[PDB]
Write a protein that holds these residues in place. Sequence first.
Motif, PDB file in Angstrom:
ATOM      1  N   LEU A   1      47.460 114.425  28.238  1.00  0.00           N
ATOM      2  CA  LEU A   1      48.626 115.053  28.856  1.00  0.00           C
ATOM      3  C   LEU A   1      49.683 114.016  29.216  1.00  0.00           C
ATOM      4  O   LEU A   1      50.878 114.227  28.977  1.00  0.00           O
ATOM      5  CB  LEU A   1      48.202 115.841  30.097  1.00  0.00           C
ATOM      6  N   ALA A   2      49.262 112.884  29.780  1.00  0.00           N
ATOM      7  CA  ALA A   2      50.217 111.833  30.117  1.00  0.00           C
ATOM      8  C   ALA A   2      50.830 111.226  28.861  1.00  0.00           C
ATOM      9  O   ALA A   2      52.042 110.982  28.808  1.00  0.00           O
ATOM     10  CB  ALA A   2      49.545 110.752  30.961  1.00  0.00           C
TER      11      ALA A   2
ATOM     12  N   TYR B   1      67.840 118.936  36.320  1.00  0.00           N
ATOM     13  CA  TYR B   1      68.405 118.100  37.352  1.00  0.00           C
ATOM     14  C   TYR B   1      69.849 117.814  37.111  1.00  0.00           C
ATOM     15  O   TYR B   1      70.372 116.897  37.679  1.00  0.00           O
ATOM     16  CB  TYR B   1      67.666 116.768  37.478  1.00  0.00           C
TER      17      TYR B   1
ATOM     18  N   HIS C   1      43.627 114.506  31.137  1.00  0.00           N
ATOM     19  CA  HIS C   1      44.709 113.897  31.903  1.00  0.00           C
ATOM     20  C   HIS C   1      45.400 112.797  31.109  1.00  0.00           C
ATOM     21  O   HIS C   1      46.629 112.670  31.151  1.00  0.00           O
ATOM     22  CB  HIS C   1      44.168 113.344  33.221  1.00  0.00           C
TER      23      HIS C   1
ATOM     24  N   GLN D   1      46.433 118.640  40.538  1.00  0.00           N
ATOM     25  CA  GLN D   1      46.444 117.250  40.093  1.00  0.00           C
ATOM     26  C   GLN D   1      47.252 117.087  38.810  1.00  0.00           C
ATOM     27  O   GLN D   1      48.210 116.307  38.762  1.00  0.00           O
ATOM     28  CB  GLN D   1      45.013 116.747  39.898  1.00  0.00           C
ATOM     29  N   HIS D   2      46.877 117.813  37.754  1.00  0.00           N
ATOM     30  CA  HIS D   2      47.586 117.656  36.488  1.00  0.00           C
ATOM     31  C   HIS D   2      48.978 118.273  36.543  1.00  0.00           C
ATOM     32  O   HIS D   2      49.868 117.856  35.793  1.00  0.00           O
ATOM     33  CB  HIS D   2      46.771 118.247  35.334  1.00  0.00           C
ATOM     34  N   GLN D   3      49.189 119.254  37.423  1.00  0.00           N
ATOM     35  CA  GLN D   3      50.537 119.769  37.636  1.00  0.00           C
ATOM     36  C   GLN D   3      51.439 118.693  38.229  1.00  0.00           C
ATOM     37  O   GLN D   3      52.531 118.428  37.712  1.00  0.00           O
ATOM     38  CB  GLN D   3      50.496 120.998  38.544  1.00  0.00           C
TER      39      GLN D   3
ATOM     40  N   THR E   1      47.295 106.051  34.326  1.00  0.00           N
ATOM     41  CA  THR E   1      47.128 107.495  34.465  1.00  0.00           C
ATOM     42  C   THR E   1      45.872 107.828  35.261  1.00  0.00           C
ATOM     43  O   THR E   1      45.893 108.693  36.146  1.00  0.00           O
ATOM     44  CB  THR E   1      47.074 108.157  33.086  1.00  0.00           C
ATOM     45  N   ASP E   2      44.760 107.154  34.952  1.00  0.00           N
ATOM     46  CA  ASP E   2      43.550 107.309  35.751  1.00  0.00           C
ATOM     47  C   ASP E   2      43.822 106.983  37.213  1.00  0.00           C
ATOM     48  O   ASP E   2      43.302 107.648  38.117  1.00  0.00           O
ATOM     49  CB  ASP E   2      42.438 106.411  35.206  1.00  0.00           C
TER      50      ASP E   2
ATOM     51  N   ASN F   1      63.296 121.314  30.919  1.00  0.00           N
ATOM     52  CA  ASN F   1      63.293 120.117  31.749  1.00  0.00           C
ATOM     53  C   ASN F   1      64.521 119.236  31.558  1.00  0.00           C
ATOM     54  O   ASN F   1      64.968 118.607  32.523  1.00  0.00           O
ATOM     55  CB  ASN F   1      62.030 119.293  31.473  1.00  0.00           C
TER      56      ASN F   1
ATOM     57  N   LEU G   1      50.929 115.505  38.210  1.00  0.00           N
ATOM     58  CA  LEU G   1      51.049 114.450  37.209  1.00  0.00           C
ATOM     59  C   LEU G   1      52.180 114.750  36.233  1.00  0.00           C
ATOM     60  O   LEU G   1      53.010 113.881  35.937  1.00  0.00           O
ATOM     61  CB  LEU G   1      49.724 114.287  36.463  1.00  0.00           C
ATOM     62  N   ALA G   2      52.234 115.986  35.729  1.00  0.00           N
ATOM     63  CA  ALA G   2      53.288 116.361  34.793  1.00  0.00           C
ATOM     64  C   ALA G   2      54.660 116.309  35.451  1.00  0.00           C
ATOM     65  O   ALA G   2      55.643 115.891  34.826  1.00  0.00           O
ATOM     66  CB  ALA G   2      53.017 117.757  34.232  1.00  0.00           C
ATOM     67  N   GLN G   3      54.745 116.729  36.716  1.00  0.00           N
ATOM     68  CA  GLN G   3      56.021 116.714  37.425  1.00  0.00           C
ATOM     69  C   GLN G   3      56.565 115.299  37.554  1.00  0.00           C
ATOM     70  O   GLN G   3      57.767 115.068  37.371  1.00  0.00           O
ATOM     71  CB  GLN G   3      55.856 117.353  38.803  1.00  0.00           C
TER      72      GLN G   3
ATOM     73  N   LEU H   1      55.871 112.706  35.601  1.00  0.00           N
ATOM     74  CA  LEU H   1      56.184 112.117  34.303  1.00  0.00           C
ATOM     75  C   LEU H   1      57.426 112.732  33.674  1.00  0.00           C
ATOM     76  O   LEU H   1      58.122 112.058  32.907  1.00  0.00           O
ATOM     77  CB  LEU H   1      54.990 112.256  33.362  1.00  0.00           C
ATOM     78  N   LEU H   2      57.718 113.999  33.975  1.00  0.00           N
ATOM     79  CA  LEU H   2      58.947 114.601  33.470  1.00  0.00           C
ATOM     80  C   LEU H   2      60.176 114.025  34.162  1.00  0.00           C
ATOM     81  O   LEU H   2      61.266 114.019  33.578  1.00  0.00           O
ATOM     82  CB  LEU H   2      58.898 116.119  33.639  1.00  0.00           C
ATOM     83  N   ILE H   3      60.022 113.540  35.397  1.00  0.00           N
ATOM     84  CA  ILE H   3      61.124 112.877  36.088  1.00  0.00           C
ATOM     85  C   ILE H   3      61.488 111.576  35.383  1.00  0.00           C
ATOM     86  O   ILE H   3      62.659 111.172  35.366  1.00  0.00           O
ATOM     87  CB  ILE H   3      60.753 112.650  37.570  1.00  0.00           C
TER      88      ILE H   3
ATOM     89  N   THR I   1      52.110 123.408  31.817  1.00  0.00           N
ATOM     90  CA  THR I   1      51.131 122.343  32.017  1.00  0.00           C
ATOM     91  C   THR I   1      49.718 122.908  32.077  1.00  0.00           C
ATOM     92  O   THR I   1      48.789 122.350  31.479  1.00  0.00           O
ATOM     93  CB  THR I   1      51.446 121.561  33.293  1.00  0.00           C
ATOM     94  N   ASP I   2      49.535 124.014  32.807  1.00  0.00           N
ATOM     95  CA  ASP I   2      48.253 124.712  32.796  1.00  0.00           C
ATOM     96  C   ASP I   2      47.856 125.096  31.378  1.00  0.00           C
ATOM     97  O   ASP I   2      46.677 125.039  31.013  1.00  0.00           O
ATOM     98  CB  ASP I   2      48.324 125.962  33.675  1.00  0.00           C
TER      99      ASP I   2
ATOM    100  N   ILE J   1      45.848 109.950  38.896  1.00  0.00           N
ATOM    101  CA  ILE J   1      44.945 111.066  39.161  1.00  0.00           C
ATOM    102  C   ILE J   1      43.969 110.705  40.275  1.00  0.00           C
ATOM    103  O   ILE J   1      43.638 111.539  41.128  1.00  0.00           O
ATOM    104  CB  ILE J   1      44.209 111.475  37.871  1.00  0.00           C
TER     105      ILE J   1
ATOM    106  N   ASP K   1      55.153 124.204  35.417  1.00  0.00           N
ATOM    107  CA  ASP K   1      53.753 124.088  35.818  1.00  0.00           C
ATOM    108  C   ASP K   1      52.865 125.027  35.012  1.00  0.00           C
ATOM    109  O   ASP K   1      51.706 124.700  34.730  1.00  0.00           O
ATOM    110  CB  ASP K   1      53.603 124.381  37.312  1.00  0.00           C
TER     111      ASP K   1
ATOM    112  N   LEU L   1      53.641 113.576  27.532  1.00  0.00           N
ATOM    113  CA  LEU L   1      54.873 113.639  28.307  1.00  0.00           C
ATOM    114  C   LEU L   1      55.630 112.316  28.301  1.00  0.00           C
ATOM    115  O   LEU L   1      56.854 112.310  28.464  1.00  0.00           O
ATOM    116  CB  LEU L   1      54.563 114.073  29.738  1.00  0.00           C
TER     117      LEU L   1
ATOM    118  N   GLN M   1      43.909 121.750  39.427  1.00  0.00           N
ATOM    119  CA  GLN M   1      45.159 122.299  38.911  1.00  0.00           C
ATOM    120  C   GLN M   1      46.360 121.582  39.510  1.00  0.00           C
ATOM    121  O   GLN M   1      47.299 121.218  38.794  1.00  0.00           O
ATOM    122  CB  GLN M   1      45.232 123.799  39.191  1.00  0.00           C
TER     123      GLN M   1
END
Lengths: 10, 10, 229, 231
Positions: free
Chosen positions: C191-192, C154, C188, D183-185, D166-167, C150, D187-189, D191-193, C170-171, D170, C167, C195, D181
Motif C-alpha cells: 500500500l505504501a 487541498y 501495509h 492504521q492503514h487509513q 513504513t513498518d 486527491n 497511513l494512506a492519508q 502518504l497522499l499529503i 484504501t479499505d 505502522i 479512506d 501511494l 483499519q
Amino acid sequence: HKILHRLLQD
Amino acid sequence: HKILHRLLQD
Amino acid sequence: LALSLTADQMVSALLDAEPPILYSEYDPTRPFSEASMMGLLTNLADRELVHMINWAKRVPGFVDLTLHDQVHLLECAWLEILMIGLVWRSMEHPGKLLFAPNLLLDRNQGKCVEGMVEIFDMLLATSSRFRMMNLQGEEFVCLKSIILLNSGVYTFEEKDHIHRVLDKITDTLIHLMAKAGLTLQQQHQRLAQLLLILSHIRHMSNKGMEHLYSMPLSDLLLEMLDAHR
Amino acid sequence: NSLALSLTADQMVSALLDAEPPILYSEYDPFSEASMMGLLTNLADRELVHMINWAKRVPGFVDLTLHDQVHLLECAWLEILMIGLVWRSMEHPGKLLFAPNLLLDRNQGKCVEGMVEIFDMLLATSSRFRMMNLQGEEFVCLKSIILLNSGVYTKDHIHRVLDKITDTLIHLMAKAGLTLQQQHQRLAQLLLILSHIRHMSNKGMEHLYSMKCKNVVPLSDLLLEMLDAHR
Ligand SMILES: O=S(=O)(Oc1cccc2ccccc12)[C@@H]1C[C@@H]2O[C@H]1C(c1ccc(O)cc1)=C2c1ccc(O)cc1
Ligand SMILES: O=S(=O)(Oc1cccc2ccccc12)[C@@H]1C[C@@H]2O[C@H]1C(c1ccc(O)cc1)=C2c1ccc(O)cc1
C-alpha cells in the motif's frame, strides 16, 4: 565542481 | 461556462 | 452512496467504469515530425478527455460533489490520469510507451520533441515499477480514482466527504491485497509503495504541464491547460 | 549489507528524532519584495547545511553512492524545507512559522507575486496535519521518506529502506492504539499529503528558477546549484 559534493563529505 | 462544465452537467 | 458499497462492490463499480483504449491516427509511412507526433498525441489526449469526463462521473462519490468541485478535480489531475493510464498500458512492453495499440514509442521517438525524453524515461521507470510490483488491474483502477479525488482536494466540509471516500478506497486496496495472500506487513508495505508512486506521477504531470503551456491544442485541452497557467 | 535494515522500529524512531536539525532564526528587523526574498533566501540557505548533515544521519542514506546522495538531495530539498515549515506551523493556524522570529500570514505573501498561492497551499497542509494530530515520530518518518522516495526513479536498496520506514509508521500507529483499519487509513492519508507537498515544491521551484526571480536576489551559489538541478 559542486558545493553539494563537499558538504556531503565533510 | 467551460467545455468541462458543459460535459459534466450533461 | 459511495460509503454504502463494500470493497468488492467498489472494485466492481470501478472496473465497469473503465474507459476504452482509444486508437491513434498514426500513419506508419508518413514521416515522423515533432509537429506530427505532437498532433498525434494531442488528438489522442483530447479524445481521451471525453471518456475521462464520463469516467469520473461513474467514480463513487464524484457525483455527490458540486459541479464546481468536479471541474476543479479534473482540471488538476487530468494529465496525471492520462499518464497512469499510459503507464498501465505499457507494463507488458518494456522500454516502450503504448500511447495506443497502433502507437508504440521508445526513448528516441521522445527525442523528436525537445525536452520530452526526460519525461519519457520517468514514464518508462514508472511502467517498469508497476511491472516488478505485478500491479493488478483492480489495484490500478483504485489508484487512478484516488488521483481524481486527491490531486485537488487541498486546492479548493465538502472536502471532508472526499476524505471519507478516499479512506473507502484504501479499505478496498487492503481488501485486495489480503485476498492475494499477502501478510499484514506485506499489505501495509505494498500500500505504501503504491501511494509513493503517485508522488512521482504528480511530479511527471507538473513537469509535463510546464512544457505543455508555452504551447496546436484543442479547445478542451486549452481550457484544461489554462487552469494550471 | 546495510545497518538500517537490522534496526528495530523504536531504534528507527530514536535515530530519526536524534538527527533532527535545529530550528534556525531569521534576521532581526514591513516587508517589501526584495526584503522578504532576502529573508527567506538567507534562512533556506542556512537550513540546507543542517539538512545535508541530517540526511547523512537518515538510516541507509550513507550506504548510497556519493552520486545517489547528491541526486536525492537535489530532488527533494524544497520538499524537505516545506514539510519542516508546515510542521513548525502546526500550532499557529493561519500563520507560517518560518522562524521563531518570523511568522507570516497570507497578506505578507502578497508583496511577492505568485507566492500567495503557495502560502495558501502551505497553510492548508499545516492545518491538515493539525486536524490529523500529526506526531513528531510520524513527521520524522515522512520527511525521511521524502528524501529517499522523491529521486528514486531518476534502486533496490532504497525501496527496502522505504519498506523499513513504513513498518515504523505502522508500528507508531499501532503503539498509539489505532485499529487495523485506522492504521492503514491513516497511513494512506499521510502518504497522499506527500503528493501535495511534491506539487507545492514543483510550483514553488518553477518560480525560483524563473529568470525574473533569479535576478531579484543574491541567491547563494549553493542555492543556485540546487536550483540548476531542476534544469
Ligand atoms: O509530459 S508530456 O510528455 O508532455 C510533454 C513533455 C515535454 C514536452 C512537451 C511538449 C509538448 C507537449 C507535451 C510535452 C505528456 C505525457 C505523454 O506525453 C505527453 C503527452 C501528451 C502530449 C501532448 C498533449 O497534447 C497531451 C499529452 C502524453 C500522453 C498523452 C496521452 C496519453 O494517453 C498518455 C500520455
Ligand atoms: O514555494 S515558494 O513560495 O517558492 C518561492 C520561492 C521564491 C520566490 C517565490 C515567488 C513566488 C512563489 C513562490 C516562490 C517557497 C516555500 C517557502 O517560501 C518559499 C521559500 C523559500 C524562499 C526563497 C528561497 O530561496 C528558498 C525557499 C520557503 C521556505 C524557505 C525555507 C523553509 O524552511 C521553508 C520554506
